[PDB]
Amino acid sequence: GSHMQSLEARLADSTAEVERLREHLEQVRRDATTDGLTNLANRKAFDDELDRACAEAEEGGTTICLAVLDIDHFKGFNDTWGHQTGDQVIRYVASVIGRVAAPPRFAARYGGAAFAMIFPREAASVVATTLEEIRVEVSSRMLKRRSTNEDLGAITVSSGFAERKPGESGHSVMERADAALYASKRGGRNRVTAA
């Protein structure tokens, strides 16, 4: 009777705003973690996912590899063509990586013009060839400046990757993969290296 029924009407209007918000919360959260320019994850979403995936590798005793990519000479590139064309080069490289990073792989915009990738349960030989396919894919086509149709020159990426040692943490693997990338850059750029 009545008061029992004034309550079921308030609890239905209340557990419905729970779902109206919990669904709206999921889509604000998806976009809070999506790097707007490229539609990949951002460094934050990546550093969270890299830690969660290292738990799954220690507790499960499985494999995980990690890769970093930088767009070569990207600073002097912006100065030549302008912020807007540079944003289009970032987008383009990001399209090449996103194609290849279907889950359980995880790809992110790790920096200003840098990317990070997670290959869970995959051997390094696979990672090493995936990065090599991405390297030539990126420099395969000649891109054009959109109003004027100029050649932008080839676009190349340097690359670093490493395999997580048994006791290694997220931060630590990243440190090593980053040393790998610096090694690729100081060795002539447009190449992959590994520890």
Ligand X SMILES: Nc1nc2c(ncn2[C@@H]2O[C@@H]3COP(=O)(O)O[C@H]4[C@@H](O)[C@H](n5cnc6c(=O)[nH]c(N)nc65)O[C@@H]4COP(=O)(O)O[C@H]3[C@H]2O)c(=O)[nH]1
For residue 95, say whether it is annotated as part of any ligand binding site: yes
Give min distance, CB of 78 to ligand X, in A: 5
Site string for a second copy, 151-190 (x = CB under 8 A): --------------------x--xx--xx--x--x-----
Residue 112's beta-bridge partner residues? none
Q: What is the CA radius of gyration of the chain?
A: 22
- By three-state DSSP, how is residue 156 classified? coil
In the region spanning residues 55 to 94, those forming contacts with ligand X, defined by CB under 6 A, are 74-75, 78, 83, 86-88, 90-92
103-141 core/surface letters (b: 16 or more CB in 10 A; e: else): eebbbbbbeebbbbbbbbebeeeebbebbeebbebbeee
Span from 6-14, 15-23, 111-119, 122-130 in contact with ligand X (CB under 6 A): 111-119
Provide the token pair at 66. Answer: 């990690």
Question: Using CB under 8 A, which residues numbered 92 to 121 contact a second copy?
Answer: 111-112
Indicate which of ligand X, a second copy, none lies near residue 117 (CB less than 5 to 8 Å, by partner kind): none
Measure the CA–CA gap between 163 and 119, rounded to whole angstroms.
10
Please indicate if the annotation marks 20 as binding a ligand. no
Which entry of ligand X, a second copy, none binds 60, CB below 5 to 8 A by partner kind? none
